Design a protein around this ligand. Structure first.
Ligand SMILES: Cc1cc(Nc2ncc(Cl)c(Nc3ccccc3S(=O)(=O)C(C)C)n2)c(OC(C)C)cc1C1CCNCC1
Length: 303
């Protein structure tokens, strides 16, 4: 059985909490993950869960990838990273049971909660700053524990609920799992890499540090403040690659306050040494939340 090391501590399949198959009920499909459907489920006042499934028709590598994902998520202990309730690997199809996030993914939340004439203040600058702070908190925990996420993006973030009081969390570690297992990428190729979220040293030299996550965080900030637009509008992966290597950077999203845009530009410094760490990113987000000129800025209303 493969071993997994995090914060200098080793774990294996035997450390995962196997939950009896009879105690799990699938309710509805929520969409698809990297390799398999994800369901809303219940574990027996039942525990509300997200059920990641492993296709029964899969290779031995798919089975080992699935196990590694369970080990990775089960070893984290942070409020801004989705909890793992357990696994059900002794029955087919195999399951990973995660904390149900009732607000769905962040990208679809921003696109659907965008202020409209119908919803005048669905969302405000403070809601965006709270999502950004929540994710920066999770990234800080990964950085302090020497774990490089490699795929910080809106599609990988989830929300506990749609309304006020929502907490944003990192809910996917598929890229980091792929690198941990083989050392490189892997199952995919050039066309599958998250090019639009990567710094120059990453796509050019294959060099990854916590400053890689800082760059991707800046891109996530743009995704947040644009209200769910795809980064580098109208540019393909190769155009982005060339644009970014030549010093090109995204313009501020529509109505973005200057102090918020300044965080993005700092995250996008060419030299990793010039980029802020997550503690500095958090201090800057915290200062933006205190500033009336930032939080009183109206979000654009989409007609
Ligand atoms: C994407 C999503 C996620 C959830 N909730 C949720 N909670 C926890 C996890 Cl781990 C999770 N995973 C998930 C779900 C769907 C597709 C892929 C994943 S994943 O684990 O592979 C990762 C990309 C988050 N979903 C979700 O939960 C419901 C109960 C609100 C709904 C959705 C969609 C449904 C169709 N409209 C847009 C939102």
């Amino acid at each position: 059985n493969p071993n997994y090391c995090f914060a200098g501590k080793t774990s294996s399949i035997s450390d995962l909490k196997e939950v009896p198959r009879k105690n799990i009920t699938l309710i509805r499909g929520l969409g698809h993950g990297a390799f398999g459907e994800v369901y809303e489920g219940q574990v027996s006042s039942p525990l509300q869960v997200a059920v990641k499934t492993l296709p029964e028709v899969c290779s031995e590598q798919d089975e080992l990838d699935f196990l590694m994902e369970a080990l990775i998520i089960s070893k984290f202990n942070h409020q801004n990273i989705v909890r793992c309730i357990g696994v059900s690997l002794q029955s087919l199809p195999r399951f990973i049971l995660l904390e149900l996030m009732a607000g769905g993914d962040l990208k679809s939340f921003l696109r659907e909660t965008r202020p409209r004439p119908s919803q005048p203040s669905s969302l405000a600058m403070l809601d965006l700053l709270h999502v950004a702070r929540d994710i920066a908190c999770g990234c800080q925990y990964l950085e302090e524990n020497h774990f490089i996420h490699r795929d910080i993006a809106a599609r990988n973030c989830l929300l506990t609920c749609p309304g006020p009081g929502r907490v944003a969390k990192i809910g996917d570690f598929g890229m980091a799992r792929d690198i941990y297992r083989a050392g490189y990428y892997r199952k995919g190729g050039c066309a599958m890499l998250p090019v639009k979220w990567m710094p120059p040293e990453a796509f050019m030299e294959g060099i990854f540090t916590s400053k890689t996550d800082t760059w991707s965080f800046g891109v996530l900030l743009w995704e947040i403040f644009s209200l769910g637009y795809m980064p580098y509008p109208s540019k393909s992966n190769q155009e982005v690659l060339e644009f970014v290597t030549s010093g090109g950077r995204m313009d501020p999203p529509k109505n973005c306050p200057g102090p918020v845009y300044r965080i993005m530009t700092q995250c996008w410094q060419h030299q990793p040494e010039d980029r802020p760490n997550f503690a500095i990113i958090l201090e800057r987000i915290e200062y933006c939340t205190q500033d009336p000129d930032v939080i009183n800025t109206a979000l654009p209303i989409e007609y």
